[model samples]
Target: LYFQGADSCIQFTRHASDVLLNLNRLRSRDILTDVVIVVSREQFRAHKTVLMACSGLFYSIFTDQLKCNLSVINLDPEINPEGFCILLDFMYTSRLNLREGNIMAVMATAMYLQMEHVVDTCRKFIKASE
Candidate 1:
């Protein structure tokens, strides 16, 4: 029995996505969480590796702390907690659900975070909704 083909490779990507989704849920449960981002008195716990993998901004911010194993980030007041939550949810589940009123704000934060997919989707949805 030998398996070496495009079908196997395609299945690999689907398996990888499922693995990431499971890791995201673990973050929600605070399991093996190493970094915490504090925003508007709310705390989001996640793994440093996962966050660095997803965002260049987070990679840059967490790079210096790699030596010290730093774990907490106090986000700026200008960052909206609601929007940030949406971003985290998207990062975990690869899904973004923005209400009509929240679309603009979440899109802005997504742009700032360099989440190209989220930004592009929100932009298209907003334009279409208008």
Candidate 2:
């Protein structure tokens, strides 16, 4: 059942994978300040701790008010309301599963993580529902 729809998920996965890959590559590269910032944003390399510990402060520091309402996804919401790690994976990897298994969870998590591209891909998946 999943394999048939695997293609939709893979598109988001590949995009998320590209961001991670680019982040890794860009981090390795020593370049100018503007070049570095471009790479970081291009790769969606926002740090998890930076965002979780103080997203408001982080935004203040950067002044990038792209998405301020997002609260990271919690791996164990009952135990940990401030979900950060799982969200980090979804933000950088875009490999979140939106299937019968926690589909909406991943969706909300992706939105909270400010992974706009991943969110769009999820919408596409829903629209393409077969």
Candidate 3:
């Protein structure tokens, strides 16, 4: 039975997702940015917590190797700067749209970053398309 004496009841199961969206929005606005990523000589401002929380590779680099003073992170030689921006957007938004092209490249980047969800989504999209 419901508590008759209670004035109100609040259910917030998706609170963590909401927090992530807020953090993503903060990054979009370039607020409290602490790290700069270097991809093909292009610099993109980001937060270590956001990056580390999203990707295991970033977690290792930011924690084990970099350790707090993350000035810059270099992308792999094969990673395309522009394509990475798309993957980065997906990481921040948790939503990805597959167009007529560029799926393979985006999937590759997501796989390299160890983003299992992204990779799984991409695989499902590809399989469905075929």
Against the unseen true structure, what C-alpha lDDT does each candidate score? 0.79, 0.43, 0.78
Residue-by-residue lDDT tens digits, candidate 3, 10-121: 5466666688798888998999988888877888888888788878788878877546675777888688766678877766776675664888888888777888888898
- What is the per-residue lDDT of model 2 for residues 6-121, given as tens digits with 9 covering 90 to 100? 55552343554565667545434622112111111232234433344323333443444653433332222332112233444443444454565454555565565455665677
lDDT (0-100) at residue 30 of candidate 1? 88
Which segments of model 2 are wrong by more than 4 Å? 1-86, 92-94
Candidate 1: the clashing residue pairs are: none
Ranking by TM-score: 1, 3, 2
Which residue pairs in model 3 clash with each other? Answer: none
| lDDT at 57, model 2 | 34
Q: What's the best-to-worst order under lDDT?
A: 1, 3, 2
* RMSD (CA, Å), each prediction: 3.2, 12.6, 4.6
Clashes of each: 0, 0, 0
lDDT score for residue 56 of model 3: 76
Residue 101, candidate 1: C-alpha displacement in angstroms:
1.9
Per-residue error (Å), model 1, residue 92: 0.9
Candidate 3 steric clashes: 0
Off by over 4 Å in 1: 1-10, 65-68
The superposed Cα distance between candidate 2 and the true structure at residue 10, in angstroms, equals: 29
Cα error, candidate 3, residue 63 (Å): 1.7
